[PDB]
């Protein structure tokens with residue numbers, strides 16, 4: 073092969089490899105056709121490995137002549153060649169993109185890659201709209217970039233069924249099978265596992281079996297009881313899979329494999345230490361094998377630009393699986409991976425909107441440069457030809473922290489401005505509470521006024537907001553925290569319209585939003601905070617391994633009460649404890665609010681479903697229903713608390729709200745927090761929901777809104793009217 077004809081094969085390979093959405097078997101197909109075409113030499117076998125900018129073709133003429141093409145990267149950085157021969161190459165050399173290896177017998181053994189099949193489970197009835205699965209996509213890209221294995225990806229999100237999974241597995245004959253098992257997928261996982269082991273027993277498969285993600289990590293005993301040879305990946309999967317591949321080659325013993333729990337021969341459960349992955353530089357662009365099918369389901373692009381939480385102190389948030397340190401992608405890798413995913417999505421006409429999976433997008437570094445890192449990512453996005461939109465999550469104190477200097481906070485505001493400039497769209501802030509006592513119980517580290525100011529600053533930059541809010545928690549005593557929460561949620565001095573920066577410095581804008589009451593009033597949207605709450609009337613869920621669960625167990629012993637039911641055991645499928653409230657009135661209110669939600673779910677689901685596809689004028693009508701429902705749901709709790717503990721100010725607000733909707737006389741005990749009385753009070757309040765749904769009914773009859781073909785709004789409205797006051801579950 074001439075030195076000029078190297079160049080031609082590289083040129084065409086670069087064009088093949090640029091199509092990063094194709095599965096590796098499809099890439100190999102195009103490589104075979106390119107090499108059979110020139111017919112200026114024949115070969116026995118080809119292998120493609122690597123990914124995106126390091127994709128590599130091996131052409132095995134036989135074991136004594138092996139050609140290696142690396143169009144996108146210096147072959148000297150190839151990790152498979154480096155494992156085979158750490159000094160094969162010349163250090164003083166122009167970059168090398170081709171090399172023929174002659175009489176290199178052991179290189180062939182390195183090119184016999186094991187096969188790994190990774191399966192993302194999905195209960196499709198609960199999640200109709202897929203998102204690119206990072207759980208398996210990053211495990212695949214890590215293995216491909218290290219050239220450790222041929223990886224097959226199966227995603228139940230796009231409709232692949234249990235029986236199709238097994239068919240796939242029989243056809244590919246993998247050496248390692250891995251299932252990602254998430255909340256609510258225990259039964260599905262056990263079904264797939266039963267069939268895998270049934271076929272191992274029958275001799276149709278021989279594979280190391282492993283499961284990963286949070287459900288088996290937290291509850292390994294229920295898995296080991298049914299599958300005692302199963303290997304559970306406790307934390308990150310990358311090095312775990314690397315080491316199972318080594319163990320396949322007898323290069324590691326089982327008790328050396330990174331980050332797994334297993335049953336040894338004596339019957340005892342072992343856990344191996346998990347070395348935290350070098351995420352900054354070893355985990356590349358998620359594999360995009362499934363992207364085409366995801367686009368057919370109108371699915372979403374996703375990326376994780378950091379792992380972990382440097383704060384890690386919220387008492388309801390368990391840190392054992394996700395870890396207590398923050399590991400960011402480099403600015404360079406973040407921009408590259410975003411470019412890859414956006415280019416691949418554009419190929420399938422997926423719109424350029426990235427959902428960042430990060431637990432904490434902004435983070436914190438020992439050198440304090442985290443804000444400059446974000447600004448540098450934003451500057452890179454602003455250099456692109458096309459704009460993007462992106463969503464992410466952040467704590468309120470990643471916006472505003474009065475324990476830090478004014479200069480820290482002013483630079484924080486500049487950072488958030490660059491986020492808005494680069495496309496920050498809907499941002500989730502974990503406010504969680506409006507009550508300083510409850511915030512302390514939540515370990516949030518924030519105050520209620522600090523939360524208000526964070527919302528002011530972000531909303532003023534034109535970023536749209538969503539907030540988590542956990543109204544009820546089991547250790548709350550009395551109604552005081554609920555009153556503080558309701559007052560917080562009714563504040564109208566928090567949400568700002570997008571403010572034109574004009575000539576203001578960052579410091580002047582910051583100063584005005586903190587202190588200038590007239591500025592705040594002029595720019596407010598006038599909407600109360602509860603309008604951006606993600607889930608109204610939410611109650612605490614007590615997950616395993618949390619400080620909050622231990623706080624509960626500690627109240628159980630200190631006041632001699634049995635709060636954790638199921639005889640102290642947790643639920644494996646949901647990774648949480650079933651727990652009752654220390655204050656029985658508060659538990660009654662939480663239960664009532666869940667029943668309220670259940671009673672309106674069918675009709676409000678239908679309204680929201682119709683809203684997705686309505687014309688502009690119907691969309692606004694249906695949206696106004698959803699706004700009014702949220703409003704009625706907020707003042708349900710204000711009304712319940714009023715009937716348990718009245719005050720003058722709350723009475724005025726409820727009377728204002730009634731009078732505002734021409735329905736002050738629709739409503740006509742006290743201090744009685746029994747379930748019976750609360751239900752009776754809520755039956756009364758439900759008359760206000762009836763008044764809203766009578767308008768929906770009239771609008772439907774008038775043709776002002778349009779029903780689905782199966783008459784779903786008609787059907788659910790009819791049921792709702794017939795079910796009034798009838799709180800059976």
Ligand code: B12
Pocket residue numbers: 190199203205206207208210211249250251252253254255256282283284285286305307308309310312313376389390391393394428429430431613
């Ligand atoms: C997207 C998302 C959702 C989506 C789910 C989308 C989907 N795919 O169906 C929605 C919005 C529906 C959701 C809901 C919930 N979620 Co959520 N979610 C996330 C989020 C933001 C991103 C997930 C992701 O892509 N992670 C990145 C990938 C790379 O990580 P991974 O899945 O853990 O995979 C790694 C390891 O687990 C391991 N691994 C995974 N699979 C496998 C397989 C094998 C074989 C092996 C060996 C290893 C392995 O290797 C991988 C790479 O290192 C995460 C935050 C996060 N960054 O993880 C929260 C998170 C997972 N969610 C969480 C929670 C609590 C919930 C809810 C209960 C809501 C709530 N907060 O009350 C519900 C559950 C609903 C249900 N399903 O029943 C918690 C989980 C508990 C915890 N603290 O660890 C997280 C961490 C957020 C938080 N801090 O509160 N979630």
Ligand SMILES: C[S@@+](CC[C@H](N)C(=O)[O-])C[C@H]1O[C@@H](n2cnc3c(N)ncnc32)[C@H](O)[C@@H]1O
Pocket residue numbers: 388431432465466467500501502503504539540541542610611612613614615
């Ligand atoms: C939407 S995710 C993103 C959280 C992310 N760590 C952050 O800091 O912003 C978590 C949100 O779900 C809600 N949530 C989490 N755990 C919960 C629990 N155990 N019970 C009730 N709500 C919970 C909280 O409102 C929280 O803000």
Ligand code: SF4
Pocket residue numbers: 381382383384385386389431432467502
């Ligand atoms: S809730 Fe958010 S900030 Fe709190 S520990 Fe969990 S990831 Fe970190």
